[PDB]
Swiss-Prot record:
Name of the protein this chain belongs to: Serine/threonine-protein kinase PknD
Shown segment, full-protein numbering: 414 to 664 of 664
Quaternary structure and interacting proteins, as annotated: Homodimer. The extracellular domain interacts with host laminin.
Species name: Mycobacterium tuberculosis (strain CDC 1551 / Oshkosh)
Sequence ranges of the NHL repeats: 1-41, 42-79, 80-121, 122-163, 164-205, 206-246
Extracellular-facing ranges: 1-246
Gene name tied to this protein: pknD
Length: 254
């Protein structure tokens, strides 16, 4: 277990989201009235007008996607100084955000109890056929197009299967108010919760989740997983990002 050196900044880090790109750069949303996206290669990315930024994601091209409480999703192409606003419509306190391998953008529109999707280049959104959501917070999408959502106020993690289009509840053990979510290349789902200061995982097809051996955690809000399967957690209560390196047999990938 390692604390990332987010040093050389004036402001309180106040992490609300974490993401890792191809090259191991780590991106964090810094949640204040003045919002920022910070990158540890420490730089503050040139986003303008972020107000309490929440979820973020980064795709294979290095484009960074961020939701905030001005009810929008903004993107910044790699290197660019001009953000664009994606044409989502009618968001209400969007929290988690995910981007799939085809560039579609998924937003947990928490205030509207829904997950909305915008295909790449599109300008009309679709509401995904989830049922019975109640203040959903985190969203993730795996390589097969399965969508996972932390349905926070129903104390469950749901998965919209791409093959059946049916919603199923994943067997996480005694989960309460799940918040952050991420999915890795093997379909392992990682979740944080408001209730317990634990980060838990569930292997694909497994019947029991396990607790990851992090130690110092206070209020883990966000989780990300890199291609080595190292896990990163926004440990909000201690103003830091912690990572837990995977076993060596996971550090081969192409």
């Amino acid at each position: 277990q390692t604390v990332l050196p987010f040093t050389g900044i004036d402001f309180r880090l106040s992490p609300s989201g974490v993401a890792v790109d191809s090259a191991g750069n780590v991106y964090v949303t810094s949640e204040g009235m003045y919002g920022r996206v910070v990158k540890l290669a420490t730089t503050v990315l040139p986003f303008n007008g972020l107000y309490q930024p929440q979820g973020l994601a980064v795709d294979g091209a290095g484009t960074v996607y961020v939701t905030d409480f001005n009810n929008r999703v903004v993107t910044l192409a790699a290197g660019s100084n001009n953000q664009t606003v994606l044409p989502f419509d009618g968001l209400n306190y969007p929290e988690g955000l995910a981007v799939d391998t085809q560039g579609a953008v998924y937003v947990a529109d928490r205030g509207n109890n829904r997950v909305v999707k915008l295909a790449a280049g599109s300008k009309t959104q679709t509401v995904l056929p989830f049922t019975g959501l109640n203040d959903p917070d985190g969203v993730a999408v795996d390589n097969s197009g399965n969508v996972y959502v932390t349905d926070t106020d129903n104390n469950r993690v749901v998965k919209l299967e791409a093959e059946s289009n049916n919603q199923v509840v994943l067997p996480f053990t005694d989960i309460t108010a799940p918040w952050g979510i991420a999915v890795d290349e093997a379909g392992t789902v990682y979740v944080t919760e408001h209730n317990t200061n634990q980060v838990v995982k569930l292997l694909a097809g497994s019947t029991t989740s396990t607790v990851l051996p992090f130690t110092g955690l206070n209020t883990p809000l966000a989780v990300a997983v890199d291609s080595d399967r190292t896990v990163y957690v926004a440990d909000r209560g201690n103003d830091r990002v912690v990572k837990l390196t995977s076993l060596e047999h996971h550090h081969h990938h192409h």
